[PDB]
Design a protein around this ligand. Structure first.
Ligand code: AGS
Ligand code: AGS
Ligand code: AGS
Ligand code: AGS
Lengths: 624, 213, 225, 82
């Protein structure tokens, strides 16, 4: 009876049917059975990576025993699951644990080979009770003669951390390696399991959802193993759908909460006996009104669809895989396809000219959302080079801005510091047994989190010509391996390698300098090697406009703004001279010609906050 | 009387109004809910660099439960603030922390699934060994307790990802830091608490200048 | 007059971190207006240069300056013994009243290639790793100093590929992978190119010694009389 | 400092005022703490000669009744400087 006090039951639970059904895995269960029915040392120990199913096999065996499809010598055996936790509850005295263990053992033995014990996670059996080894090997004698059967399942990277260290005991265990299944079998596992969730949540599930989940869970979530990271997506999708059959669906509840927030904020900001609140409140009213409009419109569309979404589809899976591991993989739900078709003229607001490069980048971003790109290859690996002050770094930062709305969310590494070969360990981590090892890599542990960022390589040509060889794999596919041996995924990050090779020779001499400063098999990895071109005096006028917009936006912190006349506006561009230094001289000119005088006036009174100042040209300089 | 001297009641605390009025972050509360309402393996873990409000989300969920704004199968769950600093603390014998942990687990699983649990800084769950923080897995990966957690990026990577077979029982909710506008919103929300504590007044221009500097 | 204001917060955030961020409280404006002459009591001569540095400080503290770029990256050069280092020291003495509160590094030592590691650090897995880099450590605290580069003509043309991105962004990354901000420092790097030649015989030395990608970064190239 | 006072402290019922040395504090409250976000440092370097002289001349009568001999400012300043 001590069993009924220190252990649960499993065959009973199977008979009353509380165990999730088990599908496939026929060879593993057959091997487990033929091991569990031998003469001496009959102990199978299921081994394998975590998640691939190591307890589901045992519960399948329990179901098979209840049914009756097992061989003759395994009839009506009443599998039991031990509990090494509640066996050491109170044993502060000397023998209160060995007594319980001996009780359980002799009770198993007095049963004429009926019981088949099942210790889950049996790598916790080593240090049962210690003080000098005395316990945990009291079953070492009974194992050999095959008194108890002791099926158990433990993970793979601990069977060589705890047990393998004690090879006197490991010898009594037979290993049954359990490999991870493929998508074709995961689809079947899901098709069989697609009833318990469909019942627990009052919803229905379409087979397209199963297939799409079993595909995306293998393509994107590259951290867990297949039979589980697939089921999780389906489960979360069904949960969300049930949460939407509640009062209101998503994308309207959030807008109404936001409207209530802006309301409670505009109400309490109105009673401001201040002046700095005038221009701060005038926009809050606009925002509240223009969000309430969208609230009413969504409301009307919902009432229409309700007067004229009951089971999950193959796109809610995509929404879950986008909300988790924030890679976006939806189906372009009409809210942004205009933005994608506009990407060119939307990036043109921060870069002027270089339509060739903007077209290439826009194409490489577009043809990846429509699922036409190479599924195991990065989203594109560009190296665009040219003379200085032309806009390459600016274009990269503008692209990261358009994509993320936060320029400080990309990965930027200055390859001008990697002049020494041995400094490559900075981005790959140090091998095991050295100083910096617990912190792992740096670029690697930056990409391993949020793997949608943009990667940027300033001044690629400054580095020692041995750093170049770490990137070969990074550009060929998306794999890099840090010190701990693990592998990160670069399949969906946009690499960019700025440079300055061939300053101003020609549009062809630089294509003979690059081929001489690189290897033949490194150029082969990149996409088109974009060549930038200098600026034209007709193109600097818009640059002047952009610089003045920037300066006004930065001045709006002191509630000033300027009114620039076209004389000065074209004079500034007429001082964009010397087509060798790009467009920075224009910035230093704006500083030297406006900022100094503006500050001189500003800190000498007479330009008190508020009133705008107009700038007007003069014979040589321009006054305010 | 098991989880009565090793735990408080965060829900009753929020009912007594002694919590701070979280403002915003509806995406993360909705994600935490649609994870906590799953069938098996329902344990979210709030992850993000330190200081960005990884607990504030849990207080927000508690306030929302108390107010009654949650789906059908989430009403009256009384989330509990568990702690291990006072379970492994006084024990000098063989197998004594185990009796306390098992008493707590037993008291949880006797009652129906309405004792949603909350361990803060759960990187203190892998120790206690000497076979501890490891007897909990059979109840974790079956949806018996819910175990809302909160841990920093560094501590997470250093303490848990070395124990892969346990990390599987968890779900990550990347709680990124907010931007300047959301910060201004939060500050304006919290203004009154400090304005009451210190008998002074605070100007909106001062709040904006603080959030910008 | 019993409530906090939008400048008490600036008072706090300047009361620590040392940055003088504010809205030009009184006295400070008098000192700034009275700068060219107040700096002249220590630097006789060189009328053209003092105006430039003074205007840089004026712009930076008046509220019109790009918040993400250093507060100035001047490189002034000229004949020997004219007062370049002394002008830099007089500046640091002006806006700190502490002559030993600036971070000068003598580029005369870095004639060797590998000696750059002192101001960067060492990669993970090498001898001095947990110590960091000298310059980066000195700047991570005291984020208001006046960096100096004594006679940057000795270090052979490889150290010019760290300043190349220290300038124009105020970024630097040490061994541990951290990042530091130079956005409110005044980089100053002297030289001795020329040595007698006219302005058009030294403005050829600069071009033939450095690169366009470099001369384009830093601000006005002041010549000393 | 461990993990037993932080759940008590991040609730607002107790107020502890501690003390330690600089390098020691840099050891036990920086690596294994993760608690430094709820501790405010206060620095007391060292008094000077002129200050410890005032301290002594303030704390003189107590001993002039403990033993009771006599005290001289010359003796006080000599002790301080030496
Ligand atoms: N052949 C299968 N048929 C049906 N469901 C399966 C099968 N293999 C795995 N599963 C399911 O996939 C999940 C795997 O869970 P488990 O196998 O219990 O985890 P595990 O294999 O024990 O790994 P650990 O290390 O013990 S957490 C469960 O939801 C199982 O129901
Ligand atoms: N096409 C452009 N549109 C807008 N601004 C531009 C453009 N080209 C240059 N600029 C301006 O010039 C500045 C310098 O350009 P950058 O691209 O940052 O220099 P760069 O292209 O990286 O050249 P190098 O080789 O790195 S020195 C930018 O920050 C802009 O202010
Ligand atoms: N959305 C929010 N609404 C209201 N207060 C917030 C919000 N986000 C942060 N706060 C406040 O900001 C501070 C953040 O403190 P906590 O979130 O409790 O610290 P934490 O997020 O747990 O980080 P660690 O890991 O514990 S140091 C508290 O004072 C919160 O009240
Ligand atoms: N205009 C000046 N005002 C004050 N002192 C000056 C002036 N011109 C030169 N000196 C003095 O000249 C001496 C040399 O000045 P430094 O700036 O230290 O030399 P330097 O400019 O570094 O020249 P090199 O190339 O480095 S040797 C110092 O004692 C200065 O005080």
């Amino acid at each position: 009876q001590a069993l009924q006090k220190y252990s649960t039951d499993l065959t009973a639970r199977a008979r009353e049917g509380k165990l999730d059904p088990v599908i496939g895995r026929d060879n593993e269960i057959r091997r487990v059975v033929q091991v569990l029915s031998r003469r001496t040392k009959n102990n199978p120990v299921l081994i394998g990576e975590p998640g691939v199913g190591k307890t589901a096999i045992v519960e399948g065996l329990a179901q098979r025993i209840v049914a009756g499809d097992v061989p003759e010598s395994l009839r009506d055996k009443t599998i039991v699951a031990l509990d090494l936790g509640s066996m050491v509850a109170g044993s502060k005295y000397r023998g209160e644990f060995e007594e319980r263990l001996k009780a359980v053992l002799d009770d198993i033995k007095n049963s004429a080979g009926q019981i088949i014990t099942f210790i889950d996670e049996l790598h916790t059996i080593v240090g049962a009770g210690a003080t000098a080894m005395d316990a945990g090997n009291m079953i070492k004698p009974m194992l050999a003669r095959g008194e108890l059967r002791l099926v158990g399942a433990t993970t793979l990277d601990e069977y060589r951390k705890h047990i393998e260290k004690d090879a006197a005991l490991e010898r009594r265990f037979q290993q049954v390696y359990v490999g991870e299944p493929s998508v074709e079998d995961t689809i079947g596992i899901l098709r069989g399991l697609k009833d318990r969730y469909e019942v627990h949540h009052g919803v229905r599930i379409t087979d397209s959802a199963l297939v799409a989940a079993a595909t995306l869970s293998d393509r994107y979530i590259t951290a867990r193993f297949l039979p589980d990271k697939a089921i999780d997506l389906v489960d979360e999708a069904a949960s969300r759908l049930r949460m939407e059959i509640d009062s209101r669906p998503v994308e309207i509840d959030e807008v109404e909460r936001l409207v209530r927030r802006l309301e409670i904020e505009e109400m309490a900001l109105s009673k401001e006996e201040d002046e700095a609140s005038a221009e701060r409140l005038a926009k809050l009213r606009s925002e509240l009104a223009d969000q309430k409009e969208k609230l009413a419109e969504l409301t009307t569309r919902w009432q229409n669809e309700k007067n004229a979404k009951e089971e999950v589809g193959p796109d809610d899976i995509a929404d879950v895989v986008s909300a988790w591991t924030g890679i976006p993989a939806g189906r372009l739900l009409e809210g942004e396809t205009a933005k994608l078709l506009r990407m060119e003229d939307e990036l043109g607001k921060r870069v002027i000219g270089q339509k060739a490069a903007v077209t290439a980048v826009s194409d490489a971003v577009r043809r990846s959302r429509a699922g036409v790109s190479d599924p195991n290859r990065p989203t594109g690996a560009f190296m665009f080079l040219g003379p200085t002050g032309v806009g390459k770094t600016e274009l990269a930062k503008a692209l990261a801005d358009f994509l993320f709305d936060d320029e400080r969310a990309m990965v930027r590494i200055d390859m001008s510091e990697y002049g020494e070969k041995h400094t490559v360990a900075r981005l790959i981590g140090a091998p095991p047994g050295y100083v910096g090892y617990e912190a792992g890599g740096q670029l690697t542990e930056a990409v391993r989190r949020r793997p949608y960022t943009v990667v940027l390589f300033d001044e690629i040509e400054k580095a020692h010509p041995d750093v170049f060889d770490v990137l070969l794999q990074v550009l060929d596919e998306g794999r890099l391996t840090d010190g701990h041996g693990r592998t990160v995924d670069f399949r969906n990050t946009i690499l960019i390698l700025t440079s300055n090779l061939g300053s101003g020779g020609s549009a062809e001499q630089v294509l003979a300098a690059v081929r001489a400063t690189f290897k033949p098999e490194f150029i082969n990895r990149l996409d088109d090697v974009l060549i930038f071109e200098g600026l034209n005096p007709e193109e600097l006028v818009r640059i002047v406009d952009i610089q003045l917009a920037q300066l006004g936006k930065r001045l709006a912190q002191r509630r000033l703004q300027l009114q620039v006349s076209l004389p000065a506006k074209r004079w500034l561009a007429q001082r964009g001279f010397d087509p060798v230094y790009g467009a920075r001289p224009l910035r230093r000119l704006v500083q030297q010609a406006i900022g100094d005088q503006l500050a001189k006036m500003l800190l000498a009174g007479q330009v008190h906050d508020g009133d705008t100042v107009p700038v007007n040209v003069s014979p040589d300089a321009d006054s305010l």
